[PDB]
Design a protein around this ligand. Structure first.
Ligand SMILES: [Cl-]
Ligand SMILES: [Cl-]
Ligand SMILES: [Zn+2]
Ligand SMILES: [Zn+2]
Ligand SMILES: [Zn+2]
Ligand SMILES: [Zn+2]
Length: 422
C-alpha cells in the first residue's frame, strides 16, 4: 500500500547531451537503472529555449522504451506542472463553467501527460495563491479528478507537490489527490510531524509522503540529508518516522545524485552512483527487517560467487553483512560507500528479495558438479571439458546478472546438466 517515489531529472539520462547544463560530463544512468521498490517515477524535465531538438531523443525513448519497460515492472510515471498553469483556463464569462473547467482539464492531460506516454500528473504549488486564483484552481482540479486520481476510478496518479502547508488552495480539493508529496529537504522528522499536524484538517497521514534530496551539481542551496553515522542522517530519521507513523511512504529528489556532496569535486562533476542511499531509504521506509535484509544480501553473494573471481572481497562482504546492525550497513557491505568501492555497483535489495522465491538449489548442485569436473579435468576428455567450461561460464555469468525469471533458471539447469550428461 505504501509508496516510494523518485524525481528523475530527465536531462541526466544517457539519451540527453548538453541539455540544461554547462557541464560536458557524460550522463551515467538510464531510466532502466531506477531501483526496484519505487512505484511512482516523476519525470522532471526542464528544456531551455533552443534545446528542444537535443531533448527529443529522450522523449522518444521515454514513450517507446522506458515507459513500457517500467510498466512491465509495475512502475507508474508522472510529471508535474506549476499551479500557475491551472489559472490559464479559458472562459467566456466572469468565471468558468463546469464545461469550461472540463474542457481545460482534458487539454492539460493531452498536452502534458498523454502525449508523453506518461500516466499521471503532479500539481506543483509553492506559492500563496489568492482567493480569486483558488476559484479557478478548485474548478480545474475538480475537473481533472474525473480522469485521474482517487475520484476517477483509474490507476492514474494525481499528486499535489509542495514545500509548505498553505491550506487555501488545498482544503477544497484535497480528496482529489492520491497523496501530497511534501518537500522537506534539509530537515529531520521534527518537521515531518509538524507539517502533518498543520495539514491534518485536510489530509490524513496515510496520504502524506515526505521527501528529501540529494545534492545537485552547481546548486547554491545546501540541503544535507545524508551523512554518516547513518542514524544521524535525515534520510534515516524521516524514513523511520514515516514507517513508524503509518505515513504514505517517502520520496527522493534527484536519484542520479545519490551519494554526492557539495564539496568542490561533486559540485561540478557528474559521476556514477551505487544508489546506496535510495536503496536503503526504500527498505527503511517499508520497515524491512534486518533479518530479511541480511538474507537478501547473502542470496546475492552466493549467486555471484560462480562468476566472480575476487574471493577476498566476497569473504569480506559476507563477514560485513553478518556484523551489520542497520539496513544501511547491510547495503554498504555489498555496494561500498561509493560507486566501485564494493563488490557490486548494482546490488538491489528489493530486486533480490523478489528472487528469494525462486529455488536455485538444483542449479547450484549442477554448477557444483561442473566445478568438480574442472578441478579433475586431467581425468576426462579435453573435448568434453571444453564444452562444459563454455556452458558453465555462460550460466555463471548470466546467474550473476541483474535479474532472472524462474523459467530462466530451469533453462540454465537443463543447459548445465546437458553439458555434464555428455
Ligand atoms: Cl486507466
Ligand atoms: Cl493508466
Ligand atoms: Zn512536482
Ligand atoms: Zn490506467
Ligand atoms: Zn551521482
Ligand atoms: Zn544500482
Amino acid at each position: 500500500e505504501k509508496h516510494f517515489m523518485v524525481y528523475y531529472r530527465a536531462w541526466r539520462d544517457k539519451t540527453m547531451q548538453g541539455v540544461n547544463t554547462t557541464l560536458p560530463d557524460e550522463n551515467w544512468l538510464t531510466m532502466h537503472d531506477i531501483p526496484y521498490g519505487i512505484d511512482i517515477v516523476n519525470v522532471f524535465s526542464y528544456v531551455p529555449k533552443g534545446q528542444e531538438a537535443l531533448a527529443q531523443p529522450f522523449y522518444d525513448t521515454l514513450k517507446n522504451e522506458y515507459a513500457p519497460a517500467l510498466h512491465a515492472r509495475g512502475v507508474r510515471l508522472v510529471r508535474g506542472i506549476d499551479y500557475s498553469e491551472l489559472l490559464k483556463v479559458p472562459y467566456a464569462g466572469t468565471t468558468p463553467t463546469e464545461a469550461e473547467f472540463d474542457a481545460y482539464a482534458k487539454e492539460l492531460l493531452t498536452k502534458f501527460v498523454d502525449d508523453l506516454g506518461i500516466d499521471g500528473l503532479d500539481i506543483d504549488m509553492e506559492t500563496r495563491p489568492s482567493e480569486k486564483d483558488i476559484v479557478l484552481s478548485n474548478g480545474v482540479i475538480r475537473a481533472l479528478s474525473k480522469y485521474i486520481g482517487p475520484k476517477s476510478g483509474t490507476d492514474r496518479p494525481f499528486l499535489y507537490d509542495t514545500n509548505a502547508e498553505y491550506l487555501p488552495p488545498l482544503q477544497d480539493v484535497s480528496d482529489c489527490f492520491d497523496f501530497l508529496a511534501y518537500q522537506q529537504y534539509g530537515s529531520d522528522d521534527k518537521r515531518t510531524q509538524r507539517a502533518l499536524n498543520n495539514l491534518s484538517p485536510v489530509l490524513n497521514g496515510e496520504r502524506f509522503v515526505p521527501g528529501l534530496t540529494f545534492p545537485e551539481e552547481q546548486d547554491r542551496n545546501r540541503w544535507y540529508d545524508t551523512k554518516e553515522p547513518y542514524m544521524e542522517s535525515n534520510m534515516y530519521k524521516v524514513a523511520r518516522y514515516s514507517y513508524e507513523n503509518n505515513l504514505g511512504g517517502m520520496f527522493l529528489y534527484a536519484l542520479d545524485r545519490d551519494g554526492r556532496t557539495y564539496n568542490e569535486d561533486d559540485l561540478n562533476q557528474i559521476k556514477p552512483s551505487n544508489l546506496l542511499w535510495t536503496k536503503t531509504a526504500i527498505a527503511e521506509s517499508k520497515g524491512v527487517s534486518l533479518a530479511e535484509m541480511k538474507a537478501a544480501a547473502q542470496h546475492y553473494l552466493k549467486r555471484i560467487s560462480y562468476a566472480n573471481t575476487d574471493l577476498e572481497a566476497q569473504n569480506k562482504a559476507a563477514e560485513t553483512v553478518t556484523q551489520a546492525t542497520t539496513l544501511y550497513d547491510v547495503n554498504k557491505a555489498i555496494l561500498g560507500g561509493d560507486y566501485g568501492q564494493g563488490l557490486s555497483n548494482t546490488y538491489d535489495a528489493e530486486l533480490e528479495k523478489g528472487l528469494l522465491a525462486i529455488d536455485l538449489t538444483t542449479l547450484y548442485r549442477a554448477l557444483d558438479q561442473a566445478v568438480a569436473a574442472i578441478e579433475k579435468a586431467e581425468s576426462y576428455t579435453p573435448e568434453t571439458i571444453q564444452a562444459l567450461q563454455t556452458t558453465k561460464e555462460s550460466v555463471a555469468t548470466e546467474l550473476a546478472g541483474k535479474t532472472y525469471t524462474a523459467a530462466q533458471v530451469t533453462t540454465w539447469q537443463t543447459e548445465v546438466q546437458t553439458a555434464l550428461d555428455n
